[PDB]
Each structure stands twice: as C-alpha cells, then as structure tokens.
Design a protein around this nucleic acid. Structure first.
Ligand SMILES: C[S@@+](CC[C@H](N)C(=O)[O-])C[C@H]1O[C@@H](n2cnc3c(N)ncnc32)[C@H](O)[C@@H]1O
Ligand code: SF4
Ligand SMILES: [Mg+2]
Ligand SMILES: [Mg+2]
Lengths: 38, 126, 400
RNA sequence: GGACCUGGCGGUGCUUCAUAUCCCUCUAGAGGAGCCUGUUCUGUAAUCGAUAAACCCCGAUCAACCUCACCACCUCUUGCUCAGCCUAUAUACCGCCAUCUUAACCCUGAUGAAGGCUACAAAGUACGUUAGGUCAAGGUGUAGCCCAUGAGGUGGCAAGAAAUGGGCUACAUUUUCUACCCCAGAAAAUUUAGC
C-alpha cells in the first residue's frame, strides 16, 4: 500500500457487504437492525 | 383417449408479512452499528449471518423459532428459543461448547439464553 | 468423422484453389440479406392500410410466438402410455393430463386472421423458401423448371420466391389452400394489392384441393410451414405420399427450426426414402439433395434439432425497424440417384471464429456429427482458410 | 306411444344502460444545417475490426510506425512455474429474463321427476414447455490444445455507394451584454413523449 502510493504521489449493495438479492431476503425478515421498508 | 375427450402452520414471524417489521413484527438482531454515524454495520451483519448458521447447525431441529441477537457494549446475547425434545444434558453440553467457541471466535463475551418450549407456537395458518 | 487431421484434404475439381479465392469456394451457399420485391412489399402495406394500429402490434406478436412454440398434435398412442404412468403413480389422471400435454387446436383462418398471418410471416416465409431454392440453383444451375405446385399456399411466398429465381422458365404456378380467405388475399397481392388489376406473375392457378390426374408431375413441389397444420400423423403421411408421387424433379419441404418442425420433416424424409408403393407409376428412386449428405437416419433427431438461419429485411411497418433472422428446418428430396460420390459435409450450427482456430459442427456423409476445431497447422492452410470463410448452412469441400 | 320435470343451450340476435383501456382535448419537440455513427450492399490475400489497453497538451479528434484480431512469409521449444491458452459447452446445470399449454336440518308437490320468495313479508334457517436469450456487475461442472487453439520476428491490412435508425452542437426579441438579483442603460403534415 505504502510502496504503490509513493510512486503515484509523484504523478450493488457494497454498503452492507451483501449480495443485492440477499439484502432483500435479510431485510424482509426484519433481520437487519433498523432496516424497515417504506 | 382421443384429444377432444381430454379437452400449513406459521409462527408469529412467519405469519406476518415483511411490511410489518416496524408495525407488528420487530427486529431479530439489535445493534447500534446501523444507526446514523455509527460504523461497522457490515461487520455486524456478517457476524449475524455466521452466528445464525452456527446456531442452527449446533442445534439442528431444536430451535422452535428464530434467534434474537442482542449486543450491548461488547456483549453478544443469543436469546434462542428451542424445543424440549433433546435431553437436558445435551442442551447443557451444546450451550457450553457454543459459548466457548463463539467467545474465542469473536474475541468478545458471547452468551446464550435458551428458552425451551413444548412445541412450535403456531400463530395462524397460511 | 470427415476431418482427420493431416489425412483429409481439400477437394480441387475445376482447379478451384488456383483459379478462385477461398471466399468463393463452391460450398458457399450463404445468401445476402433477403429483400422482398417492391411489388410484394407495396401490396402488403396497401392491403393493411385499413387497420395497422397498436392493435395489430399485439396480434402479430401473439400469432408469431404461438406458431413458433406450437407442438405437434399428440397421437393417441403417446396419450395412453402417459395415462398408464399417471394411473400407476396414483378423472384425476385426466386433470393431470390436461397439464404436461400440449393443447393442439385448428387455426381457422378467416378474413381477419389471414391479414394477421400475412403481416407476421410473409417476410419470414419468403426468406426461408428463397434460401431453400438457392440450394438447387447454386449446385445445379442448369435446372430450368417449367411447372410448380405449392401445398399450403397461404400468401404466395413460394410463388414469388420461385419467380425471383426461375421466372424465365416457369409457366405454371399451381396453388392449393383450403381457406378461401387466403386465396382471395393472395390473388389481391399478385395484383398490386387491388381486387381489380393485372397479375404480376403469369400462369398462377389457385385451387382448394390437390390435382387429381395421376400422369401429371410438377417439376418442383413445395410445402412451406404447411405440414404442421395437419391434425394427425395419418394426414401428414397421406399428403407427403401424394406430393412425392407428383414430384417430377424436386420436392422441397420447409418448417420451423424447432424440435417439432425438425421431427416432422424427418418423418417425411424417411417416408419418401423408404418407398412402400409396390409398383408406382414413377419407378425412379429418391435421394436427399439437401441439407443431408446421406440417407441414413438423422444424428440429431434424438435430443437436438437441425435448423438453418436466413437473415432478411422485413417489410417496413410500425414494428419492423431492425433486420430479423428466420430460423427454419428444410429437406429437399430429388428424384433419381446422387450425382457423384464426392458429397461434402454440411455445417448445421453457427461457425465460431476464434484466434487461429475455427469451430465447425458438421454433418458428415457417414451419418455422424463431428465437432471439428479447424486449425491451419493441424488441417492445413487451405482447409483452415476455407472454414474461416465458411458460414452456417454451407458445405465444406473435403475429400478422403 | 300419451302427459310432465330439469335443463343445457361451450348458443344466436337485438334493447337498455355501467361503457373504463383507446381516440379527440392540452404542452413541448422532431421536417432544417454541420458532424460523427449502427445496419445493408459491393471490395481485398488480409479484418469494415476492439482501446477498464494507444495517442493527447483549449474543447475535442484521425490513422497511431502503437497494440490484440486478420493475410503472406518464417522462427522458439521441453519450454514458465508437472507449463500456457480472453477456446467450447447455460445445444452442460443451476441464477435470471422471455415463448406457449394447462355440509346439515325443516317444509311443499296426495311423500313423482322436482321445488322453497313477497318487509304493511305468504317456509325457510343453518406446474410443465423451448436445438429460446443472457457467463457484462452471479455461481458448480464438463470437455478441447499442449514441436500448438502456447510464445515470438519480418512485412502487409488503410476501403466506396446509397436507403434507413439513432446520437452531439447553435438555433434570439418572453432574446442578448453590463449593474443588480426583478422600477436601469445599451445592442440587435406525419410522429414521439408527458402530464
Ligand atoms: C399458413 S399456410 C402455410 C404458409 C405459407 N405457405 C407461407 O408462405 O408461409 C397453411 C395452409 O395450409 C392449408 N391446409 C390445411 N390443411 C390442408 C389440407 N388438408 N389440404 C390443403 N391445404 C390445407 C390451410 O388452409 C392453410 O392456409
Ligand atoms: S443433422 Fe444432418 S442428417 Fe440430420 S437433418 Fe441436419 S443435415 Fe440432415
Ligand atoms: Mg440455448
Ligand atoms: Mg481498413
């Protein structure tokens, strides 16, 4: 990370880390905290 | 012959539809991570996924209804509801095993709160 | 297996490779994007001017998908065996027999439904028949038919297609169709879409039943997308026997490029090849001119289908914007014996061009399918280049 | 053969109305101009090709001597690593889209088939289918090639016509420029959508 940054300096539901289908499945069951569908 | 002659019980969580999650139903897992400004929501969700799989696999056919995964501070309370089919010795052994396994899994003080019921508590029928 | 690496070579008769490039090799039977004659195109739109609104959008789409997905009528013999299995597992069987079974209906083409068909299949039908005819013209340019018959002449697409190729020799176009509406609709189309006029193509004879005379044989007999309309296998067998008995040179049968369409044509193919008439008026035998390189049973009749595609320009309409493709199954039966013994494999699937190798699915003269991956070093520069330019429906000129 | 009962009419026409989808009604475009372009045809030994991979140096933009694909000549090999391959198969399966098929009781009729309502009330109450598409925001397998479907060198490959579809620009007097953020001064028919 540091090494690659140094040279450069000189010059879907990824929010929850779930598959987009799965987030629906979890949220419908009420499993996610505070995710109420409206 | 010729062509012309031819020509379920549901529990409370199961019974109610998803659009009652804040009207009639509740939330199984309760954590602050998803709130505004709070972090690590995805981490908590991944922990919940594994925890539910591991409970359902460590108590096969025993859980009467879904878990309740509460978290206060670093605590992790699994308030589960199971049946009275297994022997109490097996329940105690599984409680100890799963508690220790999860406490060393997440490096946090996990705990179990098994609640035995005689049978599935059916709400209605669909 | 007609492609043995290092053994099979290209067939050079008439000094092909020396005197012509590879893209024009004799097995190239690809036809450019088919455009219908302006007279036919103009007439179709004129006849539809009465009603070409949003209602016809759904009707044309509904009819097209129905015909494509239509299955063959279920014979009683297949029905009893299915009934017994459900009986063993179990009026209830009949209810389960309503499902898991296709409900085949007669399509009674009245005036209204004949317009929907014409706007849905005139362009597609013309291209498929044109491709089938091009097979005869390309391989046997000396053939000059003088007579033609069309069993199931719905919109005259066969008549128009034949005129496009053999218009300078054909003198009679025998048309048969039980629906009076189609005969009226076709007759109007030949007169510029007007009930009063002069026919564009001369010598057309519209009928409702087959000719009766035993001693009349039409040089080219055609049946395109018509044998799927018959209610039972008994009628299909009788019609094909009648058609073959009246076939002078060539019998062309075309159907949809589905499993149902392919299965239907195979039954007709074996029917003609296995002659049963003890002493027919015409004693000449029959052989498959195309698309099969053999008379042995089909290698894809088990699970798959054998279809060919022809891209064409549809008639300008409110819903015909981009070019379309007509997937169809065909079989041409010719009187006599095969012209030579150097018959060539037929490509029955799209050719996939990839870096330095070509995928070709071939039907070989030996009666087996060979998925040959052709490359320059294994098979040679000439043969690889020939397959590089070849396409679906062509012949690969290989020998030994 | 007489009389009667239930019908069904896969019913057929009219009459009255509910008569919403869809027309008509309203608003703004599109027909002009200049470009790039998709398709189709024809051409060459060759491919017209593709830049999470070139060039740029206001904005953009063409080949670039690029590069992968292609044509013609060749070369490397036990080599990278028991190597390597942007090969095939959903015509292997799932995943996802689309096609089509599809109760009891009580009264009446002489205890006959059968029938049972009047409110100022007269018996009525209780899944399959498909040579389907999609392997670009998803997976599990199956086969191919392995002195070549792997790795490289040399050169070559430049394309034209219409008919149609789309995209990008400016298009003004109810405009434009300055000061201000609204009392100032100067300039000059078809057809697609929506509500
Ligand atoms: C839809 S047309 C075929 C399509 C047409 N050849 C085309 O250009 O695509 C099929 C016709 O076959 C006719 N037909 C059905 N049974 C028949 C029979 N037994 N004898 C003669 N014609 C028949 C029907 O009247 C129908 O119009
Ligand atoms: S697979 Fe071969 S034999 Fe069968 S129909 Fe097609 S060409 Fe004929
Ligand atoms: Mg498929
Ligand atoms: Mg070029």
């Amino acid at each position: 990370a540091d090494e690659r940054l140094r040279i450069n300096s000189l010059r879907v539901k990824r929010r929850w880390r779930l598959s987009r289908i799965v987030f629906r499945h979890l949220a419908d069951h009420g499993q996610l905290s505070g995710i109420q569908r409206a | 012959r010729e062509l012309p002659c031819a020509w379920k019980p549901v529990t409370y969580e199961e019974a109610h539809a998803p659009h009652y999650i804040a009207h009639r139903k509740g939330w199984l897992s309760l954590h602050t991570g998803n709130l505004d400004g709070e972090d690590h929501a995805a981490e908590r969700t991944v922990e919940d996924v594994f925890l539910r799989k591991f409970m359902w696999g460590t108590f096969p056919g025993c859980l009467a209804d879904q878990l309740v995964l509460k978290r206060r501070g670093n605590q992790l309370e699994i308030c589960a509801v199971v049946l009275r089919q297994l022997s109490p010795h097996k329940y105690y052994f599984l409680v100890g095993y799963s508690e220790t396994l999860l406490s060393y899994f997440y490096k946090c003080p996990v705990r179990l709160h098994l609640q035995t019921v005689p049978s599935k508590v059916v709400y209605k029928y669909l | 297996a007609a492609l043995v690496p290092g053994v099979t070579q290209v067939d050079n008769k008439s000094g092909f490779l020396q005197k012509r490039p590879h893209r024009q090799h004799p097995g190239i039977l690809k036809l450019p994007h088919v455009r219908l004659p302006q007279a036919l195109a103009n007439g179709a739109q004129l006849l539809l001017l009465g009603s070409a609104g949003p209602t016809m959008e759904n009707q044309v789409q509904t009819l097209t998908s129905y015909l494509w997905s239509r299955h063959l009528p279920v014979e009683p013999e297949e029905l009893q065996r299915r009934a017994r299995h459900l009986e063993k597992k179990f009026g209830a069987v009949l209810h389960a027999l309503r499902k898991t079974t296709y409900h085949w209906q007669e399509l009674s083409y009245t005036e209204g439904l004949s317009l929907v068909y014409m706007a849905a299949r005139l362009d597609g039908g013309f291209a498929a028949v044109s491709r089938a005819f091009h097979e005869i013209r390309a391989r046997n340019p000396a053939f000059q038919p003088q007579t033609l018959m069309d069993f199931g002449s719905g919109t005259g697409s066969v008549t128009w297609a034949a005129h496009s190729i053999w218009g300078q020799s054909l003198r009679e176009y025998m048309c048969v169709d039980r629906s009076a509406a189609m005969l009226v609709l076709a007759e109007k189309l030949l007169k510029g879409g007007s009930e009063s006029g002069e026919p564009y193509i001369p010598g057309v004879f519209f009928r409702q039943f087959l000719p009766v005379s035993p001693k009349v044989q039409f040089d080219v007999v055609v049946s395109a997308f018509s044998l799927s309309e018959l209610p039972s296998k008994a009628d299909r067998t009788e019609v094909v026997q009648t058609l073959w008995r009246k076939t002078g040179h060539f019998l062309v049968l075309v159907e949809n490029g589905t499993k149902a369409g392919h299965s239907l044509l195979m039954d007709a193919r074996d029917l003609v090849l296995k002659g049963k008439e003890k002493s027919p008026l015409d004693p000449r035998p029959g052989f498959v001119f195309a698309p099969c390189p053999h008379e042995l049973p089909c290698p894809q009749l088990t699970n798959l289908a054998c279809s060919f595609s022809q891209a064409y320009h549809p008639i300008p309409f409110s819903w015909n914007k981009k070019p379309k493709e007509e997937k169809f199954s065909m079989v041409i039966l010719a009187r006599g014996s095969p012209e030579e013994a150097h018959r060539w494999p037929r490509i029955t699937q799209p050719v996939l061009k990839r870096p330095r190798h070509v995928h070709c699915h071939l039907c070989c003269p030996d009666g087996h399918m060979q998925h040959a991956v052709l490359t320059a070093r294994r098979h040679g520069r000439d043969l690889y280049r020939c397959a590089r330019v070849s396409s679906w429906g062509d012949l690969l000129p290989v020998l030994t």
